[PDB]
Design a protein around this ligand. Structure first.
Ligand SMILES: Nc1ncnc2c1ncn2[C@@H]1O[C@H](COP(=O)(O)OP(=O)(O)O)[C@@H](O)[C@H]1O
Ligand SMILES: Nc1ncnc2c1ncn2[C@@H]1O[C@H](COP(=O)(O)OP(=O)(O)O)[C@@H](O)[C@H]1O
Ligand SMILES: Nc1ncnc2c1ncn2[C@@H]1O[C@H](COP(=O)(O)OP(=O)(O)O)[C@@H](O)[C@H]1O
Ligand SMILES: Nc1ncnc2c1ncn2[C@@H]1O[C@H](COP(=O)(O)OP(=O)(O)O)[C@@H](O)[C@H]1O
Ligand SMILES: [Mg+2]
Ligand SMILES: [Mg+2]
Lengths: 443, 445, 443, 444
């Protein structure tokens, strides 16, 4: 805050900055030749379609990607195989130095599609020369989703000794300045918390050559574009930008044309959320004050069965700090999982929820990602997500074998933008729709 | 928070049947180890000069794939790029992964740290989840702040696959931030005995899940009077745990301690006091230095500054005195860079980059920080502090004068390390020694 | 610094430099004198009274028969109290007469206010406090949880006559405890440990103390408080009025009464016997402090099998009562707590949720659970053990009223050796079986 | 560096390795010799001199008569006083010649400037401080409030030849004591208690101390500081020049001189005694700590009845003098205070408001109320008592010079029993009535 705004004149300062390389792709032995026929059948096998110039070719296995061995032995240490559809096509795009757009399901590997090409980008550049800022900068919509990607970059950047900082709201900055002063090759920042440390000048965006935007759709819902364009005007314009999000409305396409240089977009996601038919959806029009009483009403209704197993969902981590701080004081056993928690800390909470030691657990969307806890009654959406991909995945946590379940959601008028497609999720699963939810179905 | 006290010493003869069950042995003698048979091993022992004395000691490994390590950890030594594991790790791993109490003595250029860190992770993953309010399962004890964090930097690089969390708790610093990391749970704790007891008295940790205890550098740790505090820490750990001792000096106190805390121990020694002792460096250690140390250093740098471009290497034993030495001379107008273990994980390679590029002729470093560097071309290596053994001294001075066949070594010796005066002349008198007018006191019997 | 820490005054020549005060304020009423010598004779015998002294007054029968002014009488009026306790029926006119007295009764019948109401009329008879003068009333309690309740009830009758009271006690920072003494206070309820300290640091003086109270004398002698008390009364004028109060009458309490009281008049009211009703199964486990949470989790899962259990965990202090309920909520258990320092009226919302099965588990202290007939209690768990057995009997006494069945699981440690002799003495009176591990601690 | 430290250094082997300083700078301007040998003899006991030594120099008459440079002499002129004190008339040639010397005089004599000015010329012969070097001049003082009096008194003659001076003393947070020592100072003012606490943390060093002074070594010896200075004087070069100063001549002060001074030379300037010129009604009251606030209030109602009363309260510490000042102000009594740390010139504005009767009550410390003519004051209450009986005689001495009447209310506690023995003989010689309760602390 105390003094800075000035935007630099990059027409004048680009000849003053050092030179960097962005293209690294290796076009490994196997891919060519196949050739140009079985890729087509493989492409739209896993929902791939191309629209761009000089398309690279998809990969099949990890070892066919031009990743070095210090990062390739970490995919092995993490036990994965068969990289995700976007990782099979997005990586040859990213290692070629191209600006690109990537949309896929939230739960797919959009994160590692830019995290791994960012490590090769860093290690090709000289040492950090203290007082130099980061080389990779990724901007995220919310505080605790920045930490999920920051726990995903620490999994593959120890080999290269890469230092990483995460800058986000809601916390004292006196700890993040002492992580930035030690140097950090990757910085994960929220636009609100990042600018006011560039205005006090404890970091620079002068070495940022590889910029990536995770979940740009969510980014637009908080009015953060006045804050991102202000700092993207503080970076060298010849960097490589990588867009990533889950949806494809008209507003992400507007943002792509303003920052990307000849962008290439990857589409893997696809409408046909099936809304597995064995879940009763009850959506209720409520307000800010009306909850915490409907929850007691639906918790004591769940309490009558034994042993019930309830899962409450929130979209922030401090709404889970609020809900849990309220159930426990009313006399309800409650456990929580959010992003600022540690996996092994979150894995003990997941273990105690399966053996039925406490029937209630509050969770966030990022924490409740790829979990199989069978036995779940009464999944409660105390909040509603920003998209219809998380809703189906939120309620998708009920009923595989027994083939029955209920999902209690608390809906309010500031969530109507998804109602129109929400009824079509209830309408395909042949669920009853309340007359007060038809208020959010027109045009 | 605040609480000042507790003391409890438990009666383990009565509390053992109430404790859960755990496994310590895991190692399975992979293909090429068996069998040879006992003809190949015979001189590979003295090829790697390792000395075993116990009963039913397992047989050494040669490959990484020959250790009973899973692939999720074996794919991490690959990402670190290591081949041909260290000699002591080639025999210490079959011993330690087999759940036996052991002591290992070798020079601090070996893999002593990872010879017990890697077997400790499989020990962790064989136990249930941490069940909050449970303390660590592995406890490693270190003498000082900056040795513990090197232990933490080798456990951090190998715990992502298993998501193992590790904390390091050490004295001389406000307690306010390590308590918030202990509460989130940590499977491995690396502690100095000085503060470790100081967190059991106000109670943010327990030693009741500790099944795999390690004592690193027990010789130097014993030299600072930490044993009266180690009595308190081992009296609160299950007596049936697995203890693994490691040190460099092989006294004359371990033999006592090893047989007071280890149950049926197995010792392996790889090092030997007989090698190198490089004669191509003029070693000039004569300065009493009690508190002169800064005054001679400017004068010994004023003589070094005359040549150009000189390249000087200052050595310290602690980080808090290694951030100091740079803090003392830079204010007199001397270009200095600092290198230690606590900070500067990636930063020390930039300082080493500016030491090769000739950007600053002076660099202060500690023994843990100056590990495996070939930055040679270094005149006038100064031991402003002195190490605990005669193998760190030789490696301190050993980084000068190989090709050009000349070098100098200035050390500052004082009564606070007189226990090593006897051993340095044994290398100095082989080294065509100087006159000890001030070591006179420190050679007899 | 806070030095020099004992100085004994010379009362023999500095007492003639201190102001004069009066101790006798009672004026016998029309219906009290006389009846006579038969109605007061029997009335002491139908209330188990036993007097011993010189010039013992006639006991009271109703509130207005006591020589109380009207501004304190209209306080018991608004409090809606019926037919004051026997110890109040005779304890009042003895205290109002300026006489040193001893009152023996069960912990809770009338003892606290037996000296508070006569202590207030003692206060309003003196000039204002002239800031930098200490208190007129000095109350000594052994523990923080007991000293708070004295202040919690002295603050209930000291607002008509504007009156301030303070608690000073160990384990807590003293900075705030001095900023209330900075305001001056007529009454102080003090722990010997923290009282000796603030006198050595010169943040209060005992020069205005003329009316001394020693509550829970049997506790203080069990905790080695006499050598600290002997130093406290070294700084009080010898013509003070000292009032002793206790629950038992061993040889060390009545030696302490003879050493400090001038012509004391004893009154014994209670029954002195602990019958330990036999329809509760008393299970005692000799454990240490690090097993207590594991076995609580295992005894709670045993109660969890019932439908529906209602357990009461017991702690002695506020700090662990906060620990226990902190730890249960993180283990997945529904937990409520009630203690004295906090929870004056919010304490009663907890009792209201615990009676109705809103929450099956409630943690409490011994003082906080005083006089609650919350029937429905199975499995009262003594996570702590008190210093005295009268509280144990009342702790376990909360299990089985009509159905006449219950369980009590106690956690016994080496630190509780002082009560083992009296713990088994009642466990065999109730003819419950004793496990061998606490036979070490008999006699 | 925060271990324990100050193990004795080996000076027979470490002294040849330090740079060198010379101590002799006195020039003995020419006509000081000769007079001679009888007109010096008349000079000696006009000022009550007592000399015992070898090769004794001759004393001074005027400021111009000393072998002082001009940069130091232009300030003795700037204060506007002539004719330095009898102890300054010989103490300067003793100290400026670099010989170990002890001077005894009353506390209030010119004992101070006999060491301040010869210490600065000793500095100016040496190079700049070369940060990380400790001080050259070290003087030891017994009390915080006496240590600040000399460092506020060193701030008068060391500005021109720029010399920085710091005061380090116990009972206060050390975080500001190290940050002025970080500035470096040729003169540092230290209490034995807080000096060892800065040598063990290694934020000052005693390697360059060449000019040691022991001011008021008598009172320092009574507080058990001797085992601590032998700890301190063994951490400094043995070839230094030491300067002792005190008012009393016990057997322990001279055995203290033979143990630390090398070939010491002795001078006294005063025919001792304090005979408590008698004009004050002394009412001693054997009291304890918790009643004194009410006891002073009753003595204030007794003074407040008079008009216009003017009372002076005395304390020994600054911190217990701010307590007294804003403790009766809570009782409704207007009080003003004077101490050594603070109130540089407002010490003088409160003094002007005290005589003209804008405020009748004033609390004071010992050093802050020394050498003031504030007469018109009755009712001086010694709420605290000093460590010796020489300050108290002056403390009560503020009551009655012309009018020939005065009162002195003293508060005595077993915290002051060390002074009870001689308190009675001063009251018995002033033939004041003696309370029965104070006779407890007199003999054996
Ligand atoms: N090929 C793969 N095999 C197994 N797990 C994977 C693979 N790719 C990613 N993951 C896991 O999925 C998660 C990554 O999800 P993320 O990419 O953040 O979702 P989004 O698509 O919203 O970015 C991480 O937990 C990662 O470990
Ligand atoms: N597989 C390996 N091959 C070769 N060197 C290794 C290997 N693993 C670790 N090292 C090196 O050996 C050292 C391991 O630390 P170590 O020397 O055991 O600490 P200490 O010996 O003081 O206990 C480090 O310097 C590290 O670079
Ligand atoms: N006359 C009365 N009528 C009804 N309740 C009373 C009366 N006197 C005291 N009480 C109750 O008894 C308690 C007073 O303290 P008490 O329990 O008597 O301590 P002790 O048991 O040590 O005497 C209060 O909780 C109050 O509600
Ligand atoms: N030559 C002088 N002329 C006038 N005043 C002096 C002279 N020397 C010292 N003083 C005064 O004496 C005080 C110095 O303290 P001092 O009284 O010497 O303490 P001590 O009694 O311990 O010697 C200063 O306040 C100063 O004003
Ligand atoms: Mg080691
Ligand atoms: Mg009571």
């Amino acid at each position: 805050q105390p003094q800075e705004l000035i935007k630099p004149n990059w027409d004048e300062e680009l000849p003053k900055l050092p030179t960097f390389e962005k293209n690294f792709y290796v076009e490994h032995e196997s891919v060519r030749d196949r050739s140009d026929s079985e890729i087509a059948q493989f492409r739209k096998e896993n929902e791939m379609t191309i629209s761009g110039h000089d398309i690279p070719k998809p990969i099949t296995t990890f070892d066919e990607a031009g990743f070095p061995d210090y990062v390739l032995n970490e995919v092995k240490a993490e036990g994965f195989d068969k990289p995700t559809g976007i990782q099979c096509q997005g990586w040859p795009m990213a290692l070629s130095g191209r600006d690109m757009v990537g949309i896929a399901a939230t739960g797919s590997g959009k994160t590692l599609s830019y995290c791994l090409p960012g490590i090769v980008h860093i290690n090709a550049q000289p040492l950090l020369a203290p007082g130099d800022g980061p080389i990779v900068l990724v901007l995220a919509p919310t505080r605790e989703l920045a930490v999920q990607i920051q726990t995903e970059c620490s999994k593959f950047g120890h080999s290269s000794r890469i230092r990483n900082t995460c800058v986000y709201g809601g916390v004292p900055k006196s700890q993040q300045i002492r992580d930035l002063s030690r140097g950090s090759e990757i910085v994960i920042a929220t636009p609100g918390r990042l600018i006011d440390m560039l205005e006090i000048g404890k970091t620079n965006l002068k070495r940022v050559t590889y910029l990536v935007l995770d979940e740009a759709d969510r980014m637009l819902d908080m009015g953060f574009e006045p804050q991102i364009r202000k700092i993207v005007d503080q970076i060298r314009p010849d960097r490589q930008t990588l867009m990533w999000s889950a949806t494809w409305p008209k507003e992400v396409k507007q943002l792509a044309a303003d920052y990307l240089n000849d962008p290439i977009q990857v589409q893997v996601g696809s409408l046909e959320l099936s809304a597995s038919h064995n879940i009763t959806q009850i959506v209720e029009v409520v307000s800010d004050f009306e909850k915490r009483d409907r929850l007691n009403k639906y918790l004591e209704t769940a309490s009558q069965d034994n042993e019930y197993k309830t899962l409450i969902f929130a979209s922030t981590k401090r709404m889970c700090d609020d809900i849990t701080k309220y159930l426990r004081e009313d006399g309800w056993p409650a456990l929580a999982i959010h992003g600022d928690k540690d996996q092994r800390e979150r894995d003990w909470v997941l273990q105690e929820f399966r053996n039925g030691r406490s029937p209630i657990m509050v969770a966030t969307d990022v924490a409740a990602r790829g979990i199989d806890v069978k036995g779940i009654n009464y999944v409660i959406n105390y909040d509603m997500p920003g998209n219809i991909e998380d809703y189906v995945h939120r309620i998708g946590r009920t009923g595989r074998a027994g083939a029955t379940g209920t999902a209690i959601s608390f809906f309010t008028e500031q969530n109507k933008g998804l109602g129109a497609k929400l009824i079509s999720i209830m309408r395909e699963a042949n669920q009853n729709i309340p007359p007060e939810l038809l208020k959010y179905d027109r045009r």
